[model samples]
Target: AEFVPFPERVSIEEYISRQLPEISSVAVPVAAETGGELTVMGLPYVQVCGTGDTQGYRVVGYTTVAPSMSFERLEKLVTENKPDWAVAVQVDKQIDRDATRGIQLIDNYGGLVEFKFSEDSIAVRSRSACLPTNKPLDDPGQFVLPSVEEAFPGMHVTISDNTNPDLHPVPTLTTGA
Candidate 1:
């Protein structure tokens, strides 16, 4: 038996950095076009779930749009952004009950993205296709803010859990205590 070189490490941050732009194409625009700022925080926060080559790999972050900066036009904007992506309105109790709304952007090219918004804030979660669980490489832990920011030129990123109290900070990883 042999492990075929994946040729690409889809599960790594490098791949996430490269593909993140397309996956999150609407995030910044959604905020700028609507209102508020975009802040994506995690990695060390939420669980790195995944799988089909899919289990439940996901990352979540929020922006200004829901109850804080509620906007009626966001729905249209979210739906009308990219012709290549299909919009699917979701049935979510968390959003359905309030003025909040939810949508899934299934990229025709590739990738799957979801957004849930109220008025002041909007939350986003997504992932590209996937690389089989058996193919995963040993990924050393580190902060990906720098690389993630590369996807969005002007977008500012921070390495923080200080409740985002500080802008950026280095990470320390340890094993085999």
Candidate 2:
């Protein structure tokens, strides 16, 4: 494939927030360990380790950014081993303090957010309605999606309002009998 230069941006955050939309949903997959203190749209979450699940897949990573040494390194790596497929998930903009907590947890485990070009896009086995994590592994996966940037980036991720629909349904016409 021809090497079309990557978008002229300083960070992946710029690319995702400005370009993509289909994969922009912020509903991350919370694991089965958070207990009940955390909630996204009223749903609880769990804390998982850096090594993510290959079973379904729910992790993301970035290898490089423009004007950086990492970018150069990534270029060399890809040239040596051409990738078979590539994907970009539009960033989740509505990250929060709690989300940062989650991201910090990931970082502590030696992982990073999926915010660069060198890393792989995170994935999940099933479609989840909110952010979640799985158990940590010793030498876990290489990439991650940072919750801090996801929640509080300069241009915040949009949070959907699905809280009240039954009481506020779309108006419909009914013929009087």
Candidate 3:
């Protein structure tokens, strides 16, 4: 599938915050224990790692749930909210008593969003880009310039996009001497 670039640049946090409510609502059955003190469900906490370049950020966290949860139920919740360009995969992981299952959702822009289910817990992670998709592509000046000064403190950064007249695969190269 071809990924259409976002018309504007958007921060990872901004994008994630917008999606958190929906994600939390969908993942209600999942819960996590807080240091044996209390159990928590939904997206109460999240950890983010910035992946510089065209790729944006990797957000990872966990939720607690029953050990014997069904993959079918989890798959339905996750796939329901996916964009038209996204695809879902349900796969098994490991073997023996501690075996588990995983689900991967690839967004239109090649983002890797995943969920891994093990005994009593569910781990979630996503690799996302800083782009706005809510607006129409035909809109002018849709791109948002990244804050290079703030992110880098001093250095000046140049951002550009590579586009073509047509969406066609380039020919592969073969050399023999």
Q: Which candidate is the best by TM-score?
A: 1
Q: Which stretches of candidate 2 lie over 4 Å from their true place?
A: 1-145, 151-154, 157-160, 166-177
Superposed Cα deviation of residue 127, candidate 2 (Å) = 10
Give lDDT tens digits, candidate 2, residues 8-110: 2122333233322212222132111111111122111122221233222222321111111233443343234322223212333444454321111112112
Relative to the true structure, candidate 1 reaches a TM of 0.53
Please provide TM-scores, in order, for all candidate models, with all chains considered together: 0.53, 0.17, 0.42
Candidate 3 wrong stretches, greater than 4 Å: 4-9, 29-56, 61-67, 72-86, 90-98, 119-177
Distance (Å) between predicted and true CA of 170, model 1?
A: 16
Question: How much lDDT does each candidate structure score?
Answer: 0.46, 0.25, 0.41
lDDT of 1: 0.46
Indicate the worst ten consecutive residues by lDDT in candidate 1: 58-67
10 residues in a row with least lDDT, candidate 3: 31-40
Top of the candidates by lDDT: 1
**Count of backbone clashes, every candidate in sequence:** 17, 34, 4
Which whole-number lDDT from 0 to 100 does residue 63 have in model 1? 28
